[PDB]
Amino acid sequence: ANNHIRTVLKLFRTIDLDDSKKSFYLTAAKYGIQTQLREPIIRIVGGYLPSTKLSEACVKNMISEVYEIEGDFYSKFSYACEDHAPYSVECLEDARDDYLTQLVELFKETKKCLRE
Amino acid sequence: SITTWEILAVSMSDKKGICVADPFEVTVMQDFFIDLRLPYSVVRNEQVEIRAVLYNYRQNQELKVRVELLHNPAFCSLATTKRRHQQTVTIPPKSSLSVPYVIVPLKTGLQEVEVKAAVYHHFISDGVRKSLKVVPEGIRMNKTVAVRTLDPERLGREGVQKEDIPPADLSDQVPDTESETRILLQGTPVAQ
Amino acid sequence: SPMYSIITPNILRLESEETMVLEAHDAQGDVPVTVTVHDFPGKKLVLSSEKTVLTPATNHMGNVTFTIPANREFKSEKGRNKFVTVQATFGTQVVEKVVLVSLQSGYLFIQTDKTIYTPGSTVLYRIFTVNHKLLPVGRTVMVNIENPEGIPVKQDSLSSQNQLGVLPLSWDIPELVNMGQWKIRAYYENSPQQVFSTEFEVKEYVLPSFEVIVEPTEKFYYIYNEKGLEVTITARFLYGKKVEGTAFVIFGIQDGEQRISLPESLKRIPIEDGSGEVVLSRKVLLDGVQNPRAEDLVGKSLYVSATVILHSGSDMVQAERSGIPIVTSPYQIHFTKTPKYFKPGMPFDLMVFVTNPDGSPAYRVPVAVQGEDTVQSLTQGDGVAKLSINTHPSQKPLSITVRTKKQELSEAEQATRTMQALPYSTVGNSNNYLHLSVLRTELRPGETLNVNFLLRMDRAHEAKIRYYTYLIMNKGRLLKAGRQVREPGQDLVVLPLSITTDFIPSFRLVAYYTLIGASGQREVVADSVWVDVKDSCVGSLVVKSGQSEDRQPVPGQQMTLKIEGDHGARVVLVAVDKGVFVLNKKNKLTQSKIWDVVEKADIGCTPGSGKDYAGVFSDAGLTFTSSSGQQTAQRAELQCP
Amino acid sequence: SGIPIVTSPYQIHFTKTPKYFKPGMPFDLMVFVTNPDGSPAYRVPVAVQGEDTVQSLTQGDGVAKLSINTHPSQKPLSITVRTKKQELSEAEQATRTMQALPYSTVGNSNNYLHLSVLRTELRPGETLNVNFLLRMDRAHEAKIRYYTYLIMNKGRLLKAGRQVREPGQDLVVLPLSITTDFIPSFRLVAYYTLIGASGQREVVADSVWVDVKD
Ligand SMILES: *[C@@H]1O[C@H](CO)[C@@H](O[C@@H]2O[C@H](CO)[C@@H](O)[C@H](O)[C@H]2NC(C)=O)[C@H](O)[C@H]1NC(C)=O
Ligand SMILES: *[C@@H]1O[C@H](CO)[C@@H](O)[C@H](O)[C@H]1NC(C)=O
Ligand SMILES: *[C@@H]1O[C@H](CO)[C@@H](O)[C@H](O)[C@H]1NC(C)=O
């Protein structure tokens, strides 16, 4: 439909990320969330009849837990980067793997909210 | 990158030997994307056009693509901090398009340009951010600073040799440009 | 007196397991023997271990395995041939034969992720360390990178210990570098003269957006054809889509190293649906060159330099195909596999290597002998067609000429070739032969094989022989020895053979017997044969995608890919965009290159048979020394003529 | 329906194996190993019980080549085949016994003939080689100067020809052209003739069975 997509965009425009963190990290995290938790979800949501009702409580839960998982990713990127220097792109790329893996598993688990 | 990847695998078995796999092909294709085609290197303070291609490989559906060039302080295009450079183009199905832009580089180093596309009546976007290398105007030229033969017994006497190498003036060298200097040592092979 | 025979590879390798088959004929009881190796000249006592006793129960058979140590004395001299002495003490009998020693001690394979690198970009290459048996080994590797003019720029000294034969290395090209054909060269510490190399070029490139392949209908141009050369342009997008643009074609004659262009052959063919064609009238080709003669063009070549432009005027790709021959005959005949020595009064084998003019092997093309043309055969998938000619028992040399007999072609187009084979020579003209007729088909590991031993001797001496001795070469060293019994009166004996995965790619089989003949003079008759095996991995590594659904994955979307390989092995991976392969597809690595290198590194270069027993053993790559005094020839050159 | 309950995961058939062997020459064994339901098994190592060093793997057609070294004796010869596939016990492997009779000539003159053929997944067009193994003493060897071979496809004389053989050769090779008209099988029948004994005409013949891809 169209109203559902507007609601999903309104939910995904409430995500607040620090500007103080590194620009390349911020771009990588935003790109990951956009390509693994917005594009498939928007594609799924767009194919609904207008009369169908959409839940939002666990979508807000999704937003809370994606905040916390991005916080943990930043934690691994900042100081838990033992393999290379802190704030280096090498361990950012290293942690991108499990970041994206966790995100896709999250989406596979949460695909059950979209219909009540 | 919107392209096809080739994966080549090589084993190392302690008991069997060495094997090389046949190439594996995976084609990463999307129904709508942008392929920013750039010259590898441009020259500072000289206008060069750029081309953005808006592919469209859907079914007979039509797309009202909107493409814009976000302002960059390292380039001189029509996009500024306040004003915006927007176009509203239409892509016939199973076809292509090319939106030209004019960009004038300002500072040397390694700058980037990017375009963003949003599709109307649907919700799908794709932006490409590539980096084009900028080099100040000039060419390659290599004068020899000095060449000499090392022979302490024959040159300098006393079994020693002191050689003075005067640095090249390089009065025509481009300002704020690095310049390497390779030092080569080669002996004299005598036999028989 | 019983004769003692020692068989060793004709060329020895430092730091490797080299076998020395010990066999005794007519031996009585247990005969202990200790084998010792001494440097030549002098006596440095390099190795004298691995002694073994013989047993009549095991048919007096035994092989000793050791390794020649690598010392500074061998490495002191690298510009001249060096030899060592192997000596065996068969109880109270002493036998010793000199043998050449080489410096090759393994192979180096260099894999680079890309083939073209822009200045200011990293270089990632892996050094593969394997031995003569193609196994991981721990050695020391020197790595050097040379600019096109020939100046080393970066040198290293790595060790393959604890790395399981894989050494990952990196290098950073300076942002300001002379472009050209860069080279990476590596060599083992023990043999600095042996240099392995790869080639990657630095270019001022940007990745294209599509691939252009020009495929002529036939990989040649018949000189008398009236239509002329036809070339088909097939432009395809990298991600599996068709192109709608325009193309330019120009045909040039490539004679020697000088390229001559044809201004009048330029055409603007509009490529549609990712396909197109363009003609070249024979008149243009004839008039373009100065000489209007026809036969002078034979031996030259053409090349197509196609340039493809999209309708949008975005990107240009230059695709070039060169090496299309100009030959009056659509087929070629090669005798690189046929044995050069037959056996009088005995079936003779004629492997003909029928190939396309460019070099690729042909397929399903009839061949026949000029005389008694009823014999015909068809080339298999490997471009080899079996033949069989009955040979009269005459000492005169026989001349064989073969000519392809494909229909719908005249007598002028068929390719011809002439070959002269010399008869096998015995000792004392005793007319004692041995032949080994074997299947030569597209053999694979596991499938069985049937060697046919065909003895030929008079009835007065058909009882003394009671067995056979056969050896199997592979990659320069022995693989398996054994005795095939033969009770008296059985003219034909069949030896079942197990072709495992270790016989890749081409094992050379020899066989010989011995007896007393003439008036009490000991003698030996030998034989050899060349057999091909399918070129494939010793293991089996396959890469396939686990996700069977969700066709054409979106960028940024994960997939899972399986790696089906042998357990306990180490796998290295690399992903390469096909754009760089579009812009450069040479100097890669594959199984074919590896097997070509291994085959080139062989020790013998005569596909079976020979002038005589000593010649047969010398060509097969073995030296055979007897206690009585029978011996092979002497080899002192690393590369055979 | 038809899933069997058999203690042995393999079966062995001797329908393609010749029932008569020439003493003193390689008697070929066409072991036909099949799955319990009836489908031809593939890639199982068959072997002879004696001299276990001899073994082979079946081709894609369910038949495996074999080769034995028959002794020059007139006694009956017995062969038993026992598969030796690994990771199975000694009871699971299938076993089969067979007793072959020796070829009998006329006058007990030992005038034999053998004819060995390549046995694989043959295709039309691909050439073939047959080996003619004569066996006679050199006193009467010079009399024979030719061979006669016949080809039978679908029970008719497909091609008859004479293969010449010069004296002194213990064997000859006859190239064969397998066209598309040889499908699905043919039987070479080779014989010669000469005066033998003390004035009695003698004839010795032979035959072989060859499969062609269907
Ligand atoms: C050559 O040496 C090898 C060394 O192993 C011999 O291989 C052994 O052969 C015996 C029986 O032939 C087997 O029982 C052993 O298991 C084999 N060894 C290994 C490690 O597998 C080989 O037999 C020798 N060649 C000859 C002709 O005896
Ligand atoms: C300067 O560079 C050129 C390549 O542009 C090359 O010939 C060489 O390195 C230098 N020229 C001379 C004449 O030495
Ligand atoms: C008869 O035999 C000859 C032998 O060459 C053969 O060519 C021919 O096809 C056979 N059939 C007839 C009818 O002649």
Side-chain angles (χ1 to χ4, degrees), chain C residues 95-111:
Chain C
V95 59
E96 65 183 1
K97 172 72 167 183
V98 299
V99 64
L100 192 138
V101 159
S102 170
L103 272 300
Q104 283 214 40
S105 53
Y107 308 132
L108 285 195
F109 304 138
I110 306 168
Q111 164 188 107

PDB file of all heavy atoms in Angstrom, chain C residues 95-111:
ATOM      1  N   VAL C  95      79.011 -52.690  -7.149  1.00  0.00           N
ATOM      2  CA  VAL C  95      78.535 -52.011  -8.348  1.00  0.00           C
ATOM      3  C   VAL C  95      78.347 -50.538  -8.021  1.00  0.00           C
ATOM      4  O   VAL C  95      77.862 -50.187  -6.941  1.00  0.00           O
ATOM      5  CB  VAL C  95      77.229 -52.635  -8.879  1.00  0.00           C
ATOM      6  CG1 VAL C  95      76.134 -52.563  -7.831  1.00  0.00           C
ATOM      7  CG2 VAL C  95      76.787 -51.930 -10.147  1.00  0.00           C
ATOM      8  N   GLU C  96      78.757 -49.672  -8.946  1.00  0.00           N
ATOM      9  CA  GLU C  96      78.658 -48.237  -8.723  1.00  0.00           C
ATOM     10  C   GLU C  96      78.512 -47.527 -10.061  1.00  0.00           C
ATOM     11  O   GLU C  96      79.216 -47.853 -11.020  1.00  0.00           O
ATOM     12  CB  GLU C  96      79.876 -47.729  -7.938  1.00  0.00           C
ATOM     13  CG  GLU C  96      81.208 -47.841  -8.660  1.00  0.00           C
ATOM     14  CD  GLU C  96      82.371 -47.387  -7.799  1.00  0.00           C
ATOM     15  OE1 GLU C  96      82.135 -47.008  -6.632  1.00  0.00           O
ATOM     16  OE2 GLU C  96      83.521 -47.419  -8.283  1.00  0.00           O
ATOM     17  N   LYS C  97      77.584 -46.576 -10.120  1.00  0.00           N
ATOM     18  CA  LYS C  97      77.271 -45.840 -11.337  1.00  0.00           C
ATOM     19  C   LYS C  97      77.133 -44.364 -11.007  1.00  0.00           C
ATOM     20  O   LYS C  97      76.476 -44.004 -10.027  1.00  0.00           O
ATOM     21  CB  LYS C  97      75.980 -46.355 -11.979  1.00  0.00           C
ATOM     22  CG  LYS C  97      75.487 -45.514 -13.143  1.00  0.00           C
ATOM     23  CD  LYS C  97      76.369 -45.692 -14.365  1.00  0.00           C
ATOM     24  CE  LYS C  97      75.720 -45.111 -15.611  1.00  0.00           C
ATOM     25  NZ  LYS C  97      76.554 -45.338 -16.824  1.00  0.00           N
ATOM     26  N   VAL C  98      77.750 -43.520 -11.818  1.00  0.00           N
ATOM     27  CA  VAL C  98      77.647 -42.079 -11.637  1.00  0.00           C
ATOM     28  C   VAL C  98      76.310 -41.597 -12.183  1.00  0.00           C
ATOM     29  O   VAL C  98      75.717 -42.216 -13.072  1.00  0.00           O
ATOM     30  CB  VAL C  98      78.828 -41.365 -12.319  1.00  0.00           C
ATOM     31  CG1 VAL C  98      80.135 -41.812 -11.694  1.00  0.00           C
ATOM     32  CG2 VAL C  98      78.825 -41.656 -13.807  1.00  0.00           C
ATOM     33  N   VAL C  99      75.824 -40.484 -11.644  1.00  0.00           N
ATOM     34  CA  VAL C  99      74.528 -39.949 -12.044  1.00  0.00           C
ATOM     35  C   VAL C  99      74.546 -38.439 -11.863  1.00  0.00           C
ATOM     36  O   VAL C  99      75.161 -37.918 -10.929  1.00  0.00           O
ATOM     37  CB  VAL C  99      73.382 -40.605 -11.244  1.00  0.00           C
ATOM     38  CG1 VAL C  99      73.502 -40.278  -9.769  1.00  0.00           C
ATOM     39  CG2 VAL C  99      72.038 -40.166 -11.782  1.00  0.00           C
ATOM     40  N   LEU C 100      73.877 -37.737 -12.774  1.00  0.00           N
ATOM     41  CA  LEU C 100      73.793 -36.288 -12.692  1.00  0.00           C
ATOM     42  C   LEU C 100      72.864 -35.869 -11.560  1.00  0.00           C
ATOM     43  O   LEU C 100      71.877 -36.541 -11.254  1.00  0.00           O
ATOM     44  CB  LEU C 100      73.297 -35.711 -14.015  1.00  0.00           C
ATOM     45  CG  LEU C 100      73.413 -34.197 -14.195  1.00  0.00           C
ATOM     46  CD1 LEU C 100      73.890 -33.870 -15.597  1.00  0.00           C
ATOM     47  CD2 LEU C 100      72.085 -33.518 -13.910  1.00  0.00           C
ATOM     48  N   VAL C 101      73.192 -34.742 -10.935  1.00  0.00           N
ATOM     49  CA  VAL C 101      72.392 -34.173  -9.858  1.00  0.00           C
ATOM     50  C   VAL C 101      72.007 -32.755 -10.244  1.00  0.00           C
ATOM     51  O   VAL C 101      72.878 -31.936 -10.560  1.00  0.00           O
ATOM     52  CB  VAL C 101      73.148 -34.182  -8.517  1.00  0.00           C
ATOM     53  CG1 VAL C 101      72.550 -33.161  -7.568  1.00  0.00           C
ATOM     54  CG2 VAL C 101      73.106 -35.567  -7.903  1.00  0.00           C
ATOM     55  N   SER C 102      70.712 -32.466 -10.214  1.00  0.00           N
ATOM     56  CA  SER C 102      70.220 -31.140 -10.543  1.00  0.00           C
ATOM     57  C   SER C 102      70.036 -30.317  -9.272  1.00  0.00           C
ATOM     58  O   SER C 102      70.270 -30.782  -8.155  1.00  0.00           O
ATOM     59  CB  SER C 102      68.913 -31.233 -11.325  1.00  0.00           C
ATOM     60  OG  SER C 102      68.317 -29.954 -11.456  1.00  0.00           O
ATOM     61  N   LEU C 103      69.605 -29.070  -9.446  1.00  0.00           N
ATOM     62  CA  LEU C 103      69.375 -28.170  -8.328  1.00  0.00           C
ATOM     63  C   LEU C 103      67.903 -27.884  -8.077  1.00  0.00           C
ATOM     64  O   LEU C 103      67.581 -27.241  -7.072  1.00  0.00           O
ATOM     65  CB  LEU C 103      70.116 -26.843  -8.554  1.00  0.00           C
ATOM     66  CG  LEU C 103      71.562 -26.756  -8.060  1.00  0.00           C
ATOM     67  CD1 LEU C 103      71.624 -26.975  -6.561  1.00  0.00           C
ATOM     68  CD2 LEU C 103      72.470 -27.737  -8.791  1.00  0.00           C
ATOM     69  N   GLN C 104      67.010 -28.332  -8.954  1.00  0.00           N
ATOM     70  CA  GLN C 104      65.585 -28.120  -8.745  1.00  0.00           C
ATOM     71  C   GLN C 104      65.129 -28.875  -7.506  1.00  0.00           C
ATOM     72  O   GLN C 104      65.424 -30.063  -7.348  1.00  0.00           O
ATOM     73  CB  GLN C 104      64.794 -28.585  -9.966  1.00  0.00           C
ATOM     74  CG  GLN C 104      64.843 -27.628 -11.142  1.00  0.00           C
ATOM     75  CD  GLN C 104      63.553 -27.615 -11.936  1.00  0.00           C
ATOM     76  OE1 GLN C 104      62.462 -27.665 -11.369  1.00  0.00           O
ATOM     77  NE2 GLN C 104      63.671 -27.546 -13.256  1.00  0.00           N
ATOM     78  N   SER C 105      64.409 -28.186  -6.624  1.00  0.00           N
ATOM     79  CA  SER C 105      63.956 -28.780  -5.372  1.00  0.00           C
ATOM     80  C   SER C 105      62.518 -28.385  -5.056  1.00  0.00           C
ATOM     81  O   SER C 105      62.143 -28.273  -3.886  1.00  0.00           O
ATOM     82  CB  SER C 105      64.884 -28.397  -4.221  1.00  0.00           C
ATOM     83  OG  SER C 105      65.050 -26.993  -4.148  1.00  0.00           O
ATOM     84  N   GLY C 106      61.710 -28.172  -6.077  1.00  0.00           N
ATOM     85  CA  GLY C 106      60.318 -27.822  -5.880  1.00  0.00           C
ATOM     86  C   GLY C 106      59.873 -26.815  -6.919  1.00  0.00           C
ATOM     87  O   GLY C 106      60.625 -26.427  -7.807  1.00  0.00           O
ATOM     88  N   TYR C 107      58.619 -26.396  -6.781  1.00  0.00           N
ATOM     89  CA  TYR C 107      58.026 -25.410  -7.669  1.00  0.00           C
ATOM     90  C   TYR C 107      57.475 -24.252  -6.851  1.00  0.00           C
ATOM     91  O   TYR C 107      57.134 -24.398  -5.675  1.00  0.00           O
ATOM     92  CB  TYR C 107      56.907 -26.010  -8.525  1.00  0.00           C
ATOM     93  CG  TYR C 107      57.303 -27.263  -9.257  1.00  0.00           C
ATOM     94  CD1 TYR C 107      56.492 -28.386  -9.234  1.00  0.00           C
ATOM     95  CD2 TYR C 107      58.481 -27.319  -9.982  1.00  0.00           C
ATOM     96  CE1 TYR C 107      56.849 -29.535  -9.907  1.00  0.00           C
ATOM     97  CE2 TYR C 107      58.847 -28.463 -10.657  1.00  0.00           C
ATOM     98  CZ  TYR C 107      58.027 -29.569 -10.617  1.00  0.00           C
ATOM     99  OH  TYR C 107      58.384 -30.714 -11.287  1.00  0.00           O
ATOM    100  N   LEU C 108      57.401 -23.088  -7.490  1.00  0.00           N
ATOM    101  CA  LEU C 108      56.819 -21.897  -6.892  1.00  0.00           C
ATOM    102  C   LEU C 108      55.703 -21.396  -7.790  1.00  0.00           C
ATOM    103  O   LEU C 108      55.918 -21.174  -8.985  1.00  0.00           O
ATOM    104  CB  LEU C 108      57.868 -20.804  -6.702  1.00  0.00           C
ATOM    105  CG  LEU C 108      58.848 -21.002  -5.551  1.00  0.00           C
ATOM    106  CD1 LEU C 108      59.568 -19.701  -5.259  1.00  0.00           C
ATOM    107  CD2 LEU C 108      58.124 -21.506  -4.323  1.00  0.00           C
ATOM    108  N   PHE C 109      54.516 -21.222  -7.220  1.00  0.00           N
ATOM    109  CA  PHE C 109      53.372 -20.685  -7.938  1.00  0.00           C
ATOM    110  C   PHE C 109      52.962 -19.371  -7.298  1.00  0.00           C
ATOM    111  O   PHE C 109      52.728 -19.311  -6.087  1.00  0.00           O
ATOM    112  CB  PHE C 109      52.206 -21.671  -7.931  1.00  0.00           C
ATOM    113  CG  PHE C 109      52.561 -23.015  -8.474  1.00  0.00           C
ATOM    114  CD1 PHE C 109      52.118 -24.166  -7.855  1.00  0.00           C
ATOM    115  CD2 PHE C 109      53.347 -23.125  -9.603  1.00  0.00           C
ATOM    116  CE1 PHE C 109      52.449 -25.402  -8.355  1.00  0.00           C
ATOM    117  CE2 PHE C 109      53.679 -24.359 -10.110  1.00  0.00           C
ATOM    118  CZ  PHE C 109      53.230 -25.500  -9.484  1.00  0.00           C
ATOM    119  N   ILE C 110      52.876 -18.323  -8.111  1.00  0.00           N
ATOM    120  CA  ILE C 110      52.586 -16.976  -7.642  1.00  0.00           C
ATOM    121  C   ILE C 110      51.179 -16.620  -8.089  1.00  0.00           C
ATOM    122  O   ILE C 110      50.892 -16.600  -9.290  1.00  0.00           O
ATOM    123  CB  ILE C 110      53.602 -15.962  -8.180  1.00  0.00           C
ATOM    124  CG1 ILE C 110      55.019 -16.408  -7.836  1.00  0.00           C
ATOM    125  CG2 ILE C 110      53.322 -14.589  -7.615  1.00  0.00           C
ATOM    126  CD1 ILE C 110      56.085 -15.638  -8.561  1.00  0.00           C
ATOM    127  N   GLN C 111      50.306 -16.334  -7.132  1.00  0.00           N
ATOM    128  CA  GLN C 111      48.937 -15.935  -7.421  1.00  0.00           C
ATOM    129  C   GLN C 111      48.748 -14.490  -6.995  1.00  0.00           C
ATOM    130  O   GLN C 111      49.016 -14.139  -5.842  1.00  0.00           O
ATOM    131  CB  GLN C 111      47.930 -16.833  -6.706  1.00  0.00           C
ATOM    132  CG  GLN C 111      46.535 -16.239  -6.667  1.00  0.00           C
ATOM    133  CD  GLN C 111      45.586 -17.024  -5.792  1.00  0.00           C
ATOM    134  OE1 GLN C 111      45.222 -16.586  -4.701  1.00  0.00           O
ATOM    135  NE2 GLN C 111      45.173 -18.190  -6.266  1.00  0.00           N
TER     136      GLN C 111
END
